[PDB]
Design a protein around this ligand. Structure first.
Ligand SMILES: CCCCNC(=O)[C@H](C)C[C@H](O)[C@H](CC(C)C)NC(=O)[C@H](CCSC)NC(=O)[C@H](CC(C)C)NC(C)=O
Length: 375
């Protein structure tokens, strides 16, 4: 039933994954970015150097002005707009139409990306973090109220777009079993990390430090963003492992890239990172393991030649752990809102060399996990 939805996302992790949508009457087609780390549905409503097309309320016989302004700040980028509702559909998604809140973006700064090909954002998180306030029902909440679509969706993001299955799970998109971790509070998709390992060696820190502030799953972020103390520990460990070679310190900052002769990338000298997530049962957890093929993001050669260049896709943050696209790529992620939990399984479009492989493994024991959440 979900075949029609398989393969409905385009783009990369560097600029985000988008799905096609239409708004207004007659329908206007726009590419909307899929963001599980916000809760506001917004589209460009005015010309802009980086936009190809945009929403034109003046041409929709179904547009309703809510006469309220709105503003949304992200970790990077922000926009001002005016609220209002209209009919929305997803072509390669469930065959339904819903009336949902839409912010018409009129002002923005560092939000749209030059030639990203998406002109809007779809916040798939909960109302609590919606702007102006939790009274502005987010798109998915509308979708679930107005139709019979199950309160559940899943993402499969692929590297070098992917698929977003609305309303269910598509068993052909993953191998192995699904492992679920509880959603701690329904605002972000907040999860609890209970242990971290680099090449099998535990980072040995207070697990509280891993969730310092919070840990969220956000398809709208590229990198794997870690808290100050954790980022330091991780980078020190990854350096040691790959000390067999040298890179600029601007590299460990994600600033300057690193290149190698085509097909000679020393994958083996880079460690695998394991994140242990809290489980569904007392004292049990599972772990997902990501390969260096995931946290080293491919970019185009600075001198535009025939080399393989990469950027370090692990940066630090002050807002807690963020599991961005580089982490979600290897995996098939189920956002089971109905049962307040998030599932992981090895993706079908999985990275891998002929030696190591991304994995989801369990069960594990972890004593006193509930003492990992920060308060
Ligand atoms: C208003 C309450 C919700 C606020 N939520 C957020 O800000 C969540 C955590 C982050 C959002 O998902 C937001 C979406 C962008 C389209 C603006 N992403 C971001 O703010 C991050 C910040 C990384 S630190 C330089 N930006 C990114 O990940 C960008 C753009 C993506 C479209 C690929 N990519 C890179 C490589 O910098």
């Amino acid at each position: 039933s979900f075949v029609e939805m398989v393969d409905n996302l385009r783009g990369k992790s560097g600029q985000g994954y988008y799905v096609e949508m239409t708004v207004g009457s007659p329908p206007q087609t726009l590419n909307i970015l899929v963001d599980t780390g916000s809760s506001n549905f917004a589209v460009g409503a005015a010309p802009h150097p980086f936009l190809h097309r945009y929403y034109q309320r003046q041409l929709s016989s179904t547009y309703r002005d809510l006469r309220k302004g709105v503003y949304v700040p992200y970790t990077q980028g922000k926009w001002e707009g005016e609220l209002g509702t209209d009919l929305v559909s997803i072509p390669h998604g469930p065959n339904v139409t819903v009336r949902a809140n839409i912010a018409a973006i009129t002002e923005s700064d560092k939000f749209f990306i030059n030639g990203s090909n998406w002109e809007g954002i779809l916040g798939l998180a909960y109302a609590e973090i919606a702007r102006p306030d939790d009274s502005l029902e987010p798109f998915f909440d509308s979708l679930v109220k107005q139709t019979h679509v199950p309160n559940l969706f899943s993402l499969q993001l692929c590297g070098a777009g992917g698929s977003m299955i609305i309303g269910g799970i598509d068993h052909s998109l993953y191998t192995g079993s699904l492992w679920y971790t509880p959603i701690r509070r329904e605002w972000y998709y907040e999860v609890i990390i209970v242990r971290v390992e680099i090449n099998g060696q535990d980072l040995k820190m207070d697990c509280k430090e891993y969730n310092y502030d919070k840990s969220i799953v956000d398809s709208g972020t590229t990198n794997l963003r870690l808290p100050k103390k954790v980022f330091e520990a991780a980078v020190k460990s990854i350096k040691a492992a790959s000390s067999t070679e040298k890179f600029p310190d601007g590299f460990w900052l994600g600033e300057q890239l690193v290149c190698w002769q085509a097909g000679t990338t020393p994958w083996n000298i880079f460690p695998v990172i394991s994140l242990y997530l809290m489980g569904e049962v007392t004292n049990q957890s599972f772990r997902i393991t990501i390969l260096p093929q995931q946290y080293l993001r491919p970019v185009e050669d600075v001198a535009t030649s025939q080399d393989d260049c990469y950027k370090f896709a692990i940066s630090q943050s002050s807002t807690g752990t963020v599991m961005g696209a580089v982490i979600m790529e290897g995996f098939y992620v189920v956002f089971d809102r109905a049962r307040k939990r998030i599932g992981f399984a090895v993706s079908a479009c999985h990275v891998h060399d002929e030696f190591r492989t991304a994995a989801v493994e369990g069960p594990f024991v972890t004593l006193d996990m509930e003492d990992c959440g920060y308060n």
